[PDB]
Design a protein around this nucleic acid. Structure first.
Ligand SMILES: [Mg+2]
Ligand SMILES: [Mg+2]
Ligand SMILES: [Mg+2]
Ligand SMILES: [Mg+2]
Ligand SMILES: [Mg+2]
Ligand SMILES: [Mg+2]
Ligand SMILES: [Mg+2]
Ligand SMILES: [Mg+2]
Ligand SMILES: [Mg+2]
Ligand SMILES: [Mg+2]
Ligand SMILES: [Mg+2]
Ligand SMILES: [Mg+2]
Ligand SMILES: [Mg+2]
Ligand SMILES: [Mg+2]
Ligand SMILES: [Mg+2]
Ligand SMILES: [Mg+2]
Ligand SMILES: [Mg+2]
Ligand SMILES: [Mg+2]
Ligand SMILES: [Mg+2]
Ligand SMILES: [Mg+2]
Ligand SMILES: [Mg+2]
Ligand SMILES: [Mg+2]
Ligand SMILES: [Mg+2]
Ligand SMILES: [Mg+2]
Ligand SMILES: [Mg+2]
Ligand SMILES: [Mg+2]
Ligand SMILES: [Mg+2]
Ligand SMILES: [Mg+2]
Ligand SMILES: [Mg+2]
Ligand SMILES: [Mg+2]
Lengths: 151, 96, 106, 127, 98, 206
RNA sequence: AAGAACCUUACCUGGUCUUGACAUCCACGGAAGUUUUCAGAGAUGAGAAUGUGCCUUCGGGAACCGUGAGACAGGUGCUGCAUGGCUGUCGUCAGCUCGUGUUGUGAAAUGUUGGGUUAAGUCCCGCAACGAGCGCAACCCUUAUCCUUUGUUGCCAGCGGUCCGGCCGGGAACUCAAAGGAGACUGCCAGUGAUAAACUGGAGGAAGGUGGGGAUGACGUCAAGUCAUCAUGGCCCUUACGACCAGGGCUACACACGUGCUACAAUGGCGCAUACAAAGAGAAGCGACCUCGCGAGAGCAAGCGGACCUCAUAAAGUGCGUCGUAGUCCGGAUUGGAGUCUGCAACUCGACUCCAUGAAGUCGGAAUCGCUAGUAAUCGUGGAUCAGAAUGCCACGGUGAAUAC
């Protein structure tokens, strides 16, 4: 990254719903190279969520993401000789990347029986924005606006 | 490498060929399921230096015990010296 | 380039050969057929060719130079004061010298 | 008549045959679902035929060996695209645009002396 | 009927031997199924290059054995004999058996 | 020690092998030991005959042995008086019938082994090492040999601290595999200890 | 150290030898060799039968074995601050130099600096510099596409019937095997750029900008490592610092650190069924099949110096069922009993098998490491060493990410 601006590696779409966004989500949830296991967990959670909240799989998924997507974050740019936390805008791609990572982290921390059940509960709460992942977004937003003095 | 150590190796090889491979039947023909007496087992008063599993397989040129290669009969470093000068047919640095 | 191996091998090195050939021709052209040291030197500008003047003095070669008001004499055995930047003036100088030198041993 | 394509993907090599018949697909004397058509890489085999819509318009007879599920499925996809073009070169353009024409040359990297595997280096400590 | 398989450490020499074997058989016989490459054997060796310690410093060598197969399907008699006394081998191993 | 062996790295490209026999694993080790035994006896016996290299090959349960020498007359001797004696001993050591061939070396001062041992002999005779190196480089370039290069090491002139003192002339492209390099080494046994000598001789590009 | 039970092995305790365990020379005596007994831990002594194989103007000779004296042999004994050779390292970093010329009284400088550019002292332009060398790049191996050739032990698209097995007629297509060729060169287009070098993008193409990986390590630095692989100057021992033997030790154990393996579980454990690899080794060897044993294994015994036979069923994965968050059907340490095999010999001190037992451990303080793609992570397979003895090392493939503003 010092010299060479680089391109991007394309990813296949989900085999069931054919969406790049869902393909990235299973990759983030995938542990240890076991994609099939991750695919099973995700699909089980989504069909459960669709049953809970009606709607559909993808649209219900998006509703959860929109409540956890950050908009601004802090970033150390100690330039003057002292460390400051300058808030900065988040790129559209980095938005959902952070959202998906937070949701997975929250679900793993959740103490239910199955991972599929954990994930369904976590992003079902995120649909109403009461979950731990939503809490982390609030902390990030709140910390950023506190340091609003810098820009 | 301590010429006495190489002397032990040659004596071990001579004894092994002299006694065993002909009295190896002693532990093969009899120490089996004949139907026994143990007289054959007690008839292991042989020099004890004739056992083939008692030779160290040293390098042919220098005679060091470690880093031996069966195919060439030389230690690792004598192999490298001969390989670089030719000597070993068909052997060359490998890349893949 | 003419009777040698120029079409042989890839085009690029042939292009390189031409590029360096024209570089050698440009830098040291007419001088190629001389095959020795000079015995006289006619110089257009003393200050703009002081390197040449210095070399001639070191080797003890006579130097004839056209020196302008800003030039530095005393490195030239035969100094010819006059303009050295005008095309008409330099053409007159070279024409006269060429005419005078065209009479060799006859 | 029959049209052919080879296909290859990370130690797998396929052998595909195309006939202008039904839409059935046979792999190593087995149905697509019987082989891997319901597990991972189910749809990559169809990907090429989705485009150049000819799903039901062509019959496929295939034999593959080497590699694993993903490697073999990738080999099948490469073989199909090479065959289709043999049955209608006009498709190349959009097949190449989809990226199926290129053979993916991404072999596994050999492990080096002094490293644990390929690039993983043993743990280091100063003091 | 009678098979010839040749082993050597370099392909430049094995190919010359096979060409000699094939041409002589054709001259004194007929047919000949032709040389068959058969897989090459690559034996690898890895040895430490320092006389002491320095475990990570080592060289890798290999010996590459090349193989060929001829197979004359029906000796014309004037063939078999000539298959003998035609060694001209200086590093290529020939086994005459069927 | 950080440079690859120039001869070994070119074995399959330009330089040939010094042994050209085939063997299975059963007898591969025995042949190597036999080749070592014959070379060490032959090199010891022909110390004064200026032997460049010994090439061994084993066709049909025999041994050929070719000797590249710069003074073939001495190696052969009167008619075959000396060569036959060598053949008898070589056959005895190898345990198989032995042929023997002699190849003369034109231009001995373009062969690194002969150059290296020439310097070694002078050093043991207490010749100034610098003069020996200068002479070898000078007369090597005098006959083609676009790239002579020499190097000594260890207790030069009887000094208490070892020193290398190399010297080159021409071009010696050690990184070009296509180049024909003729590297070799030798060793002196002066009264103060050991002195190593290395020689690189570069020739046509292919 | 690519593999310490004995050996290896040097180290220790005892028991032993002195021209010697190892080599040349001299004289003497005797073929060599083989089967047995006693004492001894053994080294070694004491014996007895057996055999007596090639030469000869015979103070005698050839391989071999014993005796005696000497020159000698022997040393893993010290010095890597006397050395050769080999190796690590800065660092695969882009630098390091020379001839001639010129400048300076001189140490030195210039070139090698400057404007652009590159992965690069890479290239162009300028320039008191003009050229050259070692380095960079290329030539080498391997991988990604295609073509010709050859076609068994490899293959089976089209034809025949088949025990439904490429099995057997057959076919040379295809995969493959391995020899020889083609291909990639900023080569072509557009734009920028001093019009130069070059750069950005596009087309085509399997591959695009040194496509991926490997080998390749400049002048030198660290009196870096190695006298124990080997060689070697000097020094030192010589009935001993040399040599032989048995047993022990290198495996100890209040402790501290480095590198690893297995876990703390439900993206999982267990039971049943089932799918898909690559690369290697094999004759004092690999060892089908069948029978026996719960098992490690045992007996009999094909084939294979091996595209043929054997090692040799890949595992993660996928379908069912169960466990339901517990120190548990997690974890497997430790220990008791009973065994297999290798080996003269498993006490110190081997591997594995069966039954039982069922520690710590519930994600780890300060701190700290690896990795930019078929990579990390995880899952199996093979080989060297080797009688036996890998969680180490060296290789092979399966699944396969996240992120570089
Ligand atoms: Mg010694
Ligand atoms: Mg052993
Ligand atoms: Mg094999
Ligand atoms: Mg190196
Ligand atoms: Mg002992
Ligand atoms: Mg011991
Ligand atoms: Mg003692
Ligand atoms: Mg040192
Ligand atoms: Mg001066
Ligand atoms: Mg410099
Ligand atoms: Mg300078
Ligand atoms: Mg510059
Ligand atoms: Mg350069
Ligand atoms: Mg310049
Ligand atoms: Mg049929
Ligand atoms: Mg492009
Ligand atoms: Mg290079
Ligand atoms: Mg030191
Ligand atoms: Mg070091
Ligand atoms: Mg030390
Ligand atoms: Mg020491
Ligand atoms: Mg130890
Ligand atoms: Mg093995
Ligand atoms: Mg358990
Ligand atoms: Mg506890
Ligand atoms: Mg728990
Ligand atoms: Mg990197
Ligand atoms: Mg593993
Ligand atoms: Mg083993
Ligand atoms: Mg792997």
């Amino acid at each position: 990254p010092r010299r060479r601006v680089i391109g991007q590696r394309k990813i296949l779409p989900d085999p069931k719903f054919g969406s790049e966004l869902l393909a990235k989500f299973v990759n983030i949830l995938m542990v240890d190279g076991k994609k099939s296991t991750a695919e099973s967990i995700v699909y089980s959670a989504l069909e459960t969520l669709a049953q809970r909240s009606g709607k559909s799989e993808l649209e219900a998924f998006e509703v959860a993401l929109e409540n956890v997507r950050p908009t601004v974050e802090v970033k150390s740019r100690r330039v003057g000789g002292s460390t400051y936390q300058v808030p900065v805008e988040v790129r559209p791609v980095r938005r959902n990347a952070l959202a998906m990572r937070w949701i997975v982290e929250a679900a793993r921390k959740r103490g239910d029986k199955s991972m599929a059940l954990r994930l369904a509960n976590e992003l079902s709460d995120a649909a109403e924005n009461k979950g731990t992942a939503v809490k982390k977004r609030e902390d990030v937003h709140r910390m950023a606006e506190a340091n609003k003095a810098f820009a | 490498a301590k010429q006495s150590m190489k002397a032990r190796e040659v004596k071990r090889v001579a004894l092994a060929d002299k006694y065993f491979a002909k009295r190896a039947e002693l532990k093969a023909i009899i120490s089996d399921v004949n139907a026994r007496w143990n007289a054959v087992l007690k008839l292991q008063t042989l020099p004890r230096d004739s056992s083939p599993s008692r030779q160290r397989n040293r390098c042919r040129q220098t005679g060091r015990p470690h880093g031996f290669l069966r195919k060439f009969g030389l230690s690792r470093i004598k192999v490298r010296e001969a390989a670089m000068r030719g000597e070993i047919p068909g052997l060359k640095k490998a890349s893949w | 380039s003419q009777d040698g191996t120029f079409d042989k091998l890839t085009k690029k090195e042939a292009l390189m050969r031409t590029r360096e050939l024209e570089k050698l021709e440009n830098s040291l052209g007419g001088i190629k057929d001389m095959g020795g040291l000079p015995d006289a030197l006619f110089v257009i500008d003393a200050d703009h060719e002081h390197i040449a003047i210095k070399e001639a003095n070191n080797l003890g070669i006579p130097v004839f130079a056209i020196v302008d008001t800003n030039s530095d004499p005393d490195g030239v055995d035969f100094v010819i004061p006059g303009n050295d930047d005008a095309i008409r003036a330099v053409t007159l100088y070279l024409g006269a010298v060429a005419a005078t030198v065209r009479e060799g041993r006859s | 008549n029959q049209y052919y394509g080879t296909g290859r993907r990370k130690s797998s090599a396929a052998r595909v045959f195309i006939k202008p018949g039904n839409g059935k697909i046979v792999i190593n004397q087995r149905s697509l679902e019987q082989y891997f058509g319901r597990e991972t890489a189910r749809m990559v085999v169809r990907q090429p035929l989705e485009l150049v819509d000819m799903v039901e318009k062509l019959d496929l007879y295939i034999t593959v060996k080497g590699g694993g599920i993903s490697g073999q499925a990738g080999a099948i996809r490469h073989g199909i695209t090479r065959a289709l073009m043999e049955y209608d070169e006009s498709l190349r353009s959009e097949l190449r645009k989809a990226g199926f024409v290129t053979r993916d040359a991404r072999q596994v990297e050999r492990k080096k002396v002094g490293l644990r595997k390929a690039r993983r280096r043993p743990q280091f400590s100063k003091r | 009927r009678i098979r010839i398989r040749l082993k050597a450490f370099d392909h430049r020499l094995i190919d010359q031997a096979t060409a000699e074997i094939v041409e002589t058989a054709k001259r004194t016989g007929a047919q000949v199924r032709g040389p068959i490459p058969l897989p090459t054997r690559k034996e690898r060796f890895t040895v430490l290059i320092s006389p002491h310690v320095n475990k990570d410093a080592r060289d890798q060598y290999e010996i590459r054995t090349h193989l060929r197969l001829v197979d004359i399907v029906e000796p014309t008699e004037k063939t078999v004999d000539a298959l003998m006394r035609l060694d001209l081998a200086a590093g290529v191993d020939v086994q005459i058996s069927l | 020690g950080q440079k690859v062996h120039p001869n070994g790295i070119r074995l399959g490209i330009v330089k040939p092998w010094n042994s050209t026999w085939f063997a299975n694993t059963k007898e591969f080790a025995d042949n190597l030991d036999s080749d070592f035994k014959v070379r060490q006896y032959l090199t010891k016996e022909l110390a004064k005959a200026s032997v460049s290299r010994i090439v061994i090959e084993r066709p049909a349960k025999s041994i050929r042995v070719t000797i590249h020498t710069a003074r073939p007359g001495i190696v052969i001797g009167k008619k075959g008086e000396d060569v036959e004696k060598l053949r008898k001993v070589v056959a005895d050591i190898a345990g198989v019938p032995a042929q023997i061939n002699i190849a003369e070396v034109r231009k001995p001062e373009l062969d690194a082994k002969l150059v290296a041992d020439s310097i070694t002999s002078q050093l043991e005779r207490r010749v100034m090492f610098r003069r020996a190196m200068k002479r070898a480089v000078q007369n090597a370039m005098r006959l083609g040999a676009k790239g002579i290069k020499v190097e000594v090491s260890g207790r030069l002139g009887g000094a208490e601290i070892a020193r290398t003192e190399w010297y080159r002339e021409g071009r010696v492209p050690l990184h070009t595999l296509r180049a024909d390099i003729d590297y070799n080494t030798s060793e002196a046994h002066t009264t103060y200890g050991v002195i190593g000598v290395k020689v690189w001789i570069f020739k046509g590009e292919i």
